[PDB]
């Protein structure tokens, strides 16, 4: 629904690549089941498409270098309307009442939760400068460094660069990026931040109508 900067861009998918927010036109990303699907629209975390019946669903988009895919084993089912079991909607017939995922992003009753994200470990920050570990946080971003060499290091408030000469191996230090500013969905594939994390509600678009 809109791009990495945060301003409304018509049909564009926005994703996260290793901490950097990137964008790609929505016609460049394809998904499919047993047969190819057609994206109808997208809004926030949600996407509305026409899909045929399949035992799984994959999403693919190709960058200028590499191809990103993701297949999940969620059955997609095609539910005919009435007492004639078709597999593709007919060209002509009679009108019957049905419930379909509407193509509107307006705020109906449904909601999900947006929570405070947990710290995401990044091993690219840690380097070996002079036979000693060096943490170089990204431009204008904190990075909590935890190390278990001689003397435990819990050094949080570093913003520019630090050298922990106590630890001589990169494998015994962990640098966690801190964001604490933009609230992520309460997903189960992300670590949970400490303390109370519920920060708001996101309306669910494309509800059944």
């Amino acid at each position, epitope marked *: 629904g809109l791009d990495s900067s945060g301003n409304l861009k018509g049909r564009t998918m926005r994703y996260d690549m290793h901490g950097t927010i990137k964008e790609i036109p929505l016609h460049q990303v394809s998904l499919y089941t047993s047969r190819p699907c057609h994206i109808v629209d997208g809004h926030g975390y949600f996407l509305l498409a026409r899909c045929p019946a399949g035992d799984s669903i994959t999403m693919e988009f190709k960058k200028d270098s590499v191809r990103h895919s993701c297949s999940v084993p969620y059955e997609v089912k095609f539910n005919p309307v009435g007492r004639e079991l078709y597999t593709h909607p007919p060209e002509h017939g009679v009108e019957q009442a049905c419930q379909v995922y509407a193509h509107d992003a307006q705020n109906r009753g449904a909601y999900v939760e947006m929570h405070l994200p947990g710290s995401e470990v990044d091993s690219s920050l840690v380097s070996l*400068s*002079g*036979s*000693s*570990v060096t943490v170089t946080p990204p431009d204008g971003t904190s990075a909590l460094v935890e190390c278990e060499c*001689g*003397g435990t*290091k819990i*050094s949080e*408030t*570093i913003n*520019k*660069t*630090k*050298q*922990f*000469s*106590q*630890c*001589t191996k990169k494998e015994q230090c962990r640098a966690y990026r801190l964001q604490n500013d933009k609230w992520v969905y309460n997903s189960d594939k992300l670590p949970k931040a400490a303390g109370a994390t519920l920060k708001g509600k996101l309306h669910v678009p494309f509800l059944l109508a």
Partner: antibody
Amino acid sequence: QVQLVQSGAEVKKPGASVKVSCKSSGYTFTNYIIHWVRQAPGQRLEWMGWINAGNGNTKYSQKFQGRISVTRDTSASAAYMELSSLKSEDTALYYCATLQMDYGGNGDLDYWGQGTLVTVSS
Amino acid sequence: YELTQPPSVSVSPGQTARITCSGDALPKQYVYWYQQKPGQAPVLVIYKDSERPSGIPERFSGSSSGTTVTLTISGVQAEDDADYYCQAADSSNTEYVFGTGTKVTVLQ
């Protein structure tokens, strides 16, 4: 408890190398770095070099090349600093600096030597 | 590359005193403040630009604004007199440099 003690006062005529030894012990010395620095009397400090125990590699100051050399022995856990081609202005106070109580790695040097300021003592 | 620090400052007891330190790439590195007593080795007073080690009175504080790093002392008293040095790594970060030094003194 970090304790480094260096050699006593030694006065010597200009034109030859001076060897000052500072030995450090009382703390985990696997990879900690000890800094040689020279301060003129009543003037700013002038960082000279840094020595790593295990690595045994030193980056010399931009102003001093060749005439400064690094000597270190694990047996005494000591560093030996020799400064050849000494001049009249090169006679100054000397310090060996090292971390004492740890909240980080380098850049946090808390413990220092007593000093080796020297003058005629005949 | 060098750190520009005034030769000395004059402050009366009971009021805050400021020491300024400047560097071209300074907002990219960390500065550390050292207190040198008369005839004594320098002692670190402020590390990581904002905090003070244990045993250092709370009066000392540090602030960073891009090029300018300010060391602030609140309620200056008798034994606060000393030389203050801001030291930090160079742009290449391999070599360390020190400030000129401020002689904080009391006129009365």
